[PDB]
Design a protein around this ligand. Structure first.
Ligand SMILES: CC/C=C\C[C@H]1C(=O)CC[C@@H]1CC(=O)O
Ligand SMILES: CC/C=C\C[C@H]1C(=O)CC[C@@H]1CC(=O)O
Lengths: 614, 614
């Protein structure tokens, strides 16, 4: 015996004015399924949105009462669930630990973990997915479970607290009819446990129509039929056109409503015929304690969040580790890109000399190397966009905080950024022949790591403002190119016009590039022009060694400074003065690179606030 | 009265061994539709591929005879058509001129154009698309015709010669059942004109099943049912499980075959039951002149190609012009990208002086400008991939040559490349302050045009080897970056190691970059170092004007050459010697850029040869 529940909704009118819903009425009990149909663009997605209070409230007029009293929004977040229309699952998780991660986010922390696992096992048996309980979910290619068992996993995630009311936006969409029958046979099994099912459906078959107990047909937001499937031949016989034998009901009726959308009559005669057809059928408790009676029967397993701030971080981190450990070809293809790019740069710029052309080749190596770190952070854009679509599904249920999501996402990607930074520094420090020994190599690893951190924080921020991968990849490639034009390599800082100098200081390439230059040209003992090398790239100075030695001391008669054959005119400190790299220290350039990464994680948080209302 | 035709096929076995088809048999007449069903992966796409001789011939064993004799491949290219499974249409064309372009490619040139237009008008009435005859076809967003009328346009393109046999791979795929009924009602109308229809179908309804006259159900390449729809209750009653009332036939039968794919029995009992069920129904001309009789009735309207080589170019060019004239926001968004990139570069590099830092800023302007021309050619990759999918549909019918496609594609894109080249040269020649006057500006326009020509030829070639836009866009961005590293700007040609110099000469950026450098530093009257400017970037030379004047003549005592206060040491010819730009002339650098574009149009032709067998 389940506790009886009755959901009644009357006079639902929704204006946006476009009047998308007009005088909808209905009634649903437990043990039954109310199916809503009618067209594409008919308003059935808007009808179950209005029944679930997921609207811009203040535009809906009408009463929605459960068991007699009312439905405010704070009761409907405890006893209801809304399964949205698609599957958005992590592919490398088995369906037992997919449902177990949902239990840790939503069921209370007062419940022991042994009883949480018992709820998952009882839900695996109630759904039709006992046969594949340790198979991974899979994707395009990893060979997991089928499309009809993925649908019962995404349904079973949303019913983890075992609600009393269950809203479903087209739960059989995209399935073949032998797996679209097992979905509705599971939804009939949930209804027999004491639940109220309200679902949208496109084209029900003859098999799933025996399981639906009530039907509502809509025609641009007007109800044109309301009743059992075994009243549909009796309904349209009174309208003037009965249903033939060996024809699918709710299919000829669905075609007749689309046929009656012409220009002479319209469906207004059918809206008026329905609202007096219901008038021929007129003849024929204790909601706060009825809910509490059902918790004693064993239904409602389940503060705004079930866990504190630190439990949600360690659960989100463990899920992201377990999902990327079982895909060890995403990190392997990122290691292989960085090593090949570093191997090419190390063999082109192999062992640069202390020539004036080797100084300009050092600046070109560093400008190209810093720009590859920011570009190779853009291949995380498809996986950064898979989540934030799963995240937007789970924050409708208050599964975890918005702070715990951004913090655990910044934590799990940081071990991969250390391996990428160490792989690029090992391939390029000793082969290009950079300066510093061991302390210069360690600063080289730190600023490569700070560039991977700020470049992935920038792509994380872009993955919250773009809809698809191609738009966000175009924006990365375009803005990185202008970060390189304004980095001080193509045109120096003291030569950039003053109406463009605001974008020089906003360049994400400028600060790591100015840090590796000051790490490189830091020794006072390095020398790039000695003695007779004053006359190399001038027309004066195509002469012999003995001829330029009297060219040197003939300059010493004028000034008084004696320039020997080895005087060390141009050092590394003079290279940085020629390029204009003088304003910030190399440790202050490292801190602006780390600080730019933190700013793009904060702007990513602020776009997840606005992305919930959008 | 139509001429009678009979298509009979027996003992079709196809091994690849995986035996994808095993002992298929059937018979089809005119006026009737043979529908093939059974599963996903069942082999129904392979069955109509074998009936249309579109296989690797030599692996099929079995006889396929039309009207008694045989079917070799040269008769089946005159009297048959194969409609493939999707719509691939140009969106800006009305459906009258979409069918009129198909008539000019396939109907013979002996036919007058007045009779070609009469064939299009008679086909518009036979299809269900008289109501939208001048509506454009449309796409994702341009609001053309509906999805069910797009299907009858793509069907009507393939029946433009009015064949006798019509193969159809799932012609109702992706349609709602009120538009999937009008497709089969049109296919029944074509059959009544004297045609043989053989189609695949997923999930027929109760309405389209009345139009199909024969059914063949397959179960991994074995026939399990063969007969009329009004023999399906009688068939499965003898198997042990009849069909219930108010259940869709060919749906319960389709589910039972999927149910009988278990592990104990299998469908082998049903394959054996079918091949003796057909044995209980055993009791109950002049093909070369039967075809010629039907041409007299008015069916077959239609050399390997219907038009000469030059008529196909002027028809393909007119179609590409008419399709892009009605989309004047693809060229407008390409003008807007080039002008904004040119405006940014002209205000950063505004009016460069004849300083040693203005020389290095000229090299960075030219390296950045030449790299934007090759990048902005990559936004033609989605439209270059829409065609070559339409082209691969139309070369199954020999609509036009492979030479006419590549030549007219290189012709229609060239007026847009002239406007892009003139827009970049106008924004940047006078603002950066480049040298040459008018003859230097005209060479500047020519090498920007040669860079747009070779960069779009490179993207045209990539659009014949990549499947999707995201892979080809990743390859462009990666290879352009290494074309810039090896262009001589980051490291000069005489400093590149000899194991990498093969890729320097293959760089697409090197030759236009070396042409604008030699156009710029060509005047013998330009000067970048004069007199006392010998001591600018050295520690010698932080002195006054009078102090360096005795530094000048003190060098003249040694050599004998007198260096005045104005001697013009470094000219533009010395800048090119310092960069190593000495091997090729600027006209020979322009010709290698034009010649690289022609090579990538030839490699694009050679990938359309291999792309037909692939
Ligand atoms: C060093 C970058 C080379 C060329 C610059 C171009 C890109 O690489 C991507 C964007 C830029 C053109 C644009 O979009 O304005
Ligand atoms: C001047 C180009 C700047 C950085 C180079 C990176 C790109 O811009 C695209 C590819 C390259 C990294 C790679 O893919 O190896």
């Amino acid at each position: 015996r389940p506790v009886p529940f009755v959901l009644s909704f009357n006079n639902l009118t929704y204006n946006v004015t476009k009047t998308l819903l007009d005088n909808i009425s209905g009634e649903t009990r437990d043990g039954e399924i109310l199916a809503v149909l009618g067209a594409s663009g008919s308003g059935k997605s808007t009808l179950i949105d209005a029944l679930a209070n997921r609207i811009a409230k203040g535009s809906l007029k009408g009463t929605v009462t459960l068991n007699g009293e009312a439905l405010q929004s704070r009761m409907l977040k405890v006893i209801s669930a809304y399964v949205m229309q698609d599957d958005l699952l992590f592919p490398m998780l088995t369906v037992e630990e997919t449902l177990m991660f949902a239990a840790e986010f939503r069921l209370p922390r007062s419940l022991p973990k042994s009883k949480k696992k018992l709820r998952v096992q009882a839900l695996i048996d109630q759904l039709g997915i006992r046969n594949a309980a340790k198979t991974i979910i899979g994707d395009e290619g990893h060979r997991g479970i089928s499309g009809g068992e993925r649908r019962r996993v995404s349904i079973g995630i949303d019913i983890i607290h075992d609600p009393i009311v269950l809203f479903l936006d087209e739960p059989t969409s995209g399935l073949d009819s032998t797996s679209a029958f097992m979905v509705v046979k599971v939804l009939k099994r949930i209804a027999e446990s004491g639940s109220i099912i309200i679902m949208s459906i496109h084209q029900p078959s003859h098999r799933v129509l025996s399981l639906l107990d009530r039907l509502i047909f809509l025609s641009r937001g007007h109800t044109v039929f309301s009743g059992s499937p075994a009243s549909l031949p009796s309904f349209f016989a009174g309208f003037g056109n009965p249903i033939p034998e060996n024809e699918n009901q709710t299919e000829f009726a669905l075609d007749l409503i689309r046929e009656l959308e012409g220009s002479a009559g319209g469906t207004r005669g059918l809206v008026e015929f329905n609202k007096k057809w219901q008038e021929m059928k007129k003849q024929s408790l204790t909601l706060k304690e009825a809910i509490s009676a059902s918790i004693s029967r064993g239904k409602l397993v389940s503060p705004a969040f079930a866990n504190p701030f630190w439990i949600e971080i360690k659960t989100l981190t463990r899920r992201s580790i377990l999902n990327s450990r079982r895909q060890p070809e995403l990190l392997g293809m990122r290691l292989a890109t960085v090593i090949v790019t570093g191997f090419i740069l190390a063999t082109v710029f192999w062992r640069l000399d202390n020539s004036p052309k080797g100084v300009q080749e050092r600046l070109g190596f560093f400008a190209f190397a810093m720009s590859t770190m920011f570009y190779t952070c853009a291949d995380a854009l498809p996986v950064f966009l898979q989540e934030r679509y799963i995240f937007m599904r789970e924050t409708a249920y208050n599964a975890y905080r918005r702070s715990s999501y951004v913090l655990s996402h910044a934590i799990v990607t940081f071990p991969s950024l250390i391996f990428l930074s160490l792989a690029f520094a090992v391939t390029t420090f000793w082969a290009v022949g950079l300066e510093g020994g061991l302390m210069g190599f360690l600063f080289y690893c730190l600023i490569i790591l700070a560039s991977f951190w700020s470049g992935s924080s920038f792509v994380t921020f872009l993955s919250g403002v773009v809809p698809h991968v191609m738009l966000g990849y175009t924006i990365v490639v375009a803005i990185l190119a202008y970060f390189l034009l304004f980095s001080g390599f193509f045109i120096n800082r003291d030569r950039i016009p003053q109406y463009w100098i605001w974008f020089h200081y906003l360049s994400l390439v400028k600060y790591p590039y100015e840090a590796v230059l000051q790490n490189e040209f830091s020794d006072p003992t390095e020398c790039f022009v000695r003695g007779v090398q004053l006359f190399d790239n001038s027309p004066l100075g195509e002469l012999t060694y003995g001829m330029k030695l009297r060219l040197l001391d003939s300059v010493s008669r004028s000034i008084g400074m004696r320039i020997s054959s080895s005087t060390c005119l141009t050092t590394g400190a003079d290279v940085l003065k020629q390029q204009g790299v003088t304003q910030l220290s190399k440790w202050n350039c490292l801190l602006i690179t780390v600080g730019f990464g933190f700013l793009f994680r904060i702007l990513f948080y602020l776009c997840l606030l606005l992305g919930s209302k959008n």
